Amino acid sequence: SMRILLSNDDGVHAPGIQTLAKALREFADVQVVAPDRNRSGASNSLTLESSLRTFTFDNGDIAVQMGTPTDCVYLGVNALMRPRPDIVVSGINAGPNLGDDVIYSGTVAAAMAGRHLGFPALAVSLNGYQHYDTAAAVTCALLRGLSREPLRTGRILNVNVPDLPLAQVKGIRVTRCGSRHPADKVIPQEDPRGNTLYWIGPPGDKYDAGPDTDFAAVDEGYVSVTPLHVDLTAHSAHDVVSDWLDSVGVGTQW
Amino acid sequence: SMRILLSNDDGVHAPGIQTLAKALREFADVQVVAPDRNRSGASNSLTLESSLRTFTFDNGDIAVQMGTPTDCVYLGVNALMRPRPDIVVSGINAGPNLGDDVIYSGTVAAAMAGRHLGFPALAVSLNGYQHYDTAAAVTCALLRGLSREPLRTGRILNVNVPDLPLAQVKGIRVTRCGSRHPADKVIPQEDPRGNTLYWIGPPGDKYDAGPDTDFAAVDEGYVSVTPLHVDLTAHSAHDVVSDWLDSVGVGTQW
Ligand SMILES: [Mg+2]
Ligand SMILES: [Mg+2]
């Protein structure tokens, strides 16, 4: 009955999106529009300079060739899926999307692209690689919840599932995004001709990971549910910025 | 005296970043780490699957080959620039970065990557293609302001400059991000073999563009300054989401 646009950032060949597709197919109409390769770190990137080609597999799965997760959802909703989906579900990602990492997340971005549909979009990420079935079960519960009663406020739900058997999941926590210290590591590596190439290093250590953060919930064995929005305004900085400008005389003659 | 990491998303061959480099060089030490091509829509994407090669031009400008604006700033701060920069400036972009478009913006993303440095990073975008000198002048004023007195709160400043002679700029407004209606257009286009390719269409119409939004300030001929943060949490949705979960019985047996 429910029309689900299913995407991810790991690609069409990810167990995560496959497991979830099979699970969601049990009770809903599902359509897989996904990248052709691992587009981790793709964030909210989208293809503007080129048009997009859509490669279909035997099972019906639509890849978008060179496509970003945002491209996939954009095409899914406006072009490919008829009738238009009720919800976008993104995942299950192999790996967590927590804290300030969510801005870099293609999984999150796919969900953010579905923010205007009738149901809040779900980004679903597993804190590891083992228990997709656990994350599938959590995803299905939320969808079951959405069918029972619509979520009035909150247009995106960032969901992170501990890499545990479902029996060991302690429950669900409504959380806020934590944050890390700045990532400072670059990993240099020479090419055969001696030229120095650079790899982006690991993330910074956790900084803001308290009582109520997505980090802490997951570390404790709870599902973290964070409502997300696309408004990047640091609203609490408004007055400080205004007073600063006046104090330094920028934008005023006096 | 001031150490500036200068990046963009238009590329090394953009007049925008060139104009600003020459202008900033008048009073500060500037280093251009930028993409090799037009990476508009690159958002906060970053290269994880590959290491990165850095192409230097005669004038000193460092391109990062296949590099995203985030890659450029990441490498700039942690690897390339010694001593470490005091600030990241990103722009001047050819085109506005306003409203909910900022999540897709490589220009903004480059600035967000510099959020941990001693000075708030600046993303600078021109509402058109003509008056880079105007945007350069606004950028220099803000930097002049920062040298006079440090900005206590707000780690990123999204700056949008009307495409006007400086004399016609009305002043500066501290704004919040506006928003648009959902973008719904896809532009189909056949390839020589008859296959249908899809272009991402134009943005949706402005929805939230009032008294205090970045959209309205720019339309009125003011510089818009929006403090941005990387926290995507829709904080006001917290209680609604929690009550919803309990009501539908997800995460509770009862
Ligand atoms: Mg991934
Ligand atoms: Mg651009």
Swiss-Prot record, chains A, B:
- Which cofactor is recorded for it? a divalent metal cation
Subcellular localization: Cytoplasm
Residue positions binding a divalent metal cation: D9, D10, S40, N93
Q: Which UniProt keywords apply?
A: Cytoplasm, Hydrolase, Metal-binding, Nucleotide-binding
What are this entry's molecular-function GO terms?
Answer: 3'-nucleotidase activity; 5'-nucleotidase activity; exopolyphosphatase activity; metal ion binding; nucleotide binding
Q: Which residues form the signal peptide?
A: none
Q: Which reaction does it catalyse?
A: a ribonucleoside 5'-phosphate + H2O = a ribonucleoside + phosphate; a ribonucleoside 3'-phosphate + H2O = a ribonucleoside + phosphate; [phosphate](n) + H2O = [phosphate](n-1) + phosphate + H(+)
Please share the entry's free-text remark on the cofactor. Answer: Binds 1 divalent metal cation per subunit.
- Asked if the record carries the keyword Ligase, the reply is no
Q: Which SUPFAM superfamilies match?
A: SurE-like
Pfam families to which the protein is assigned, alphabetical: SurE
* GO CC list: cytoplasm
Query: Which EC numbers characterise this protein's activity in its record?
Result: 3.1.3.5, 3.1.3.6, 3.6.1.11
- Is this entry keyworded Cytoplasm? yes
Please describe what this protein does. Nucleotidase with a broad substrate specificity as it can dephosphorylate various ribo- and deoxyribonucleoside 5'-monophosphates and ribonucleoside 3'-monophosphates with highest affinity to 3'-AMP. Also hydrolyzes polyphosphate (exopolyphosphatase activity) with the preference for short-chain-length substrates (P20-25). Might be involved in the regulation of dNTP and NTP pools, and in the turnover of 3'-mononucleotides produced by numerous intracellular RNases (T1, T2, and F) during the degradation of various RNAs.
Spell out the family assignment given in the record's similarity comment: Belongs to the SurE nucleotidase family.
Q: Identify this protein by name.
A: 5'/3'-nucleotidase SurE
Source organism per UniProt:
Salmonella typhimurium (strain LT2 / SGSC1412 / ATCC 700720)
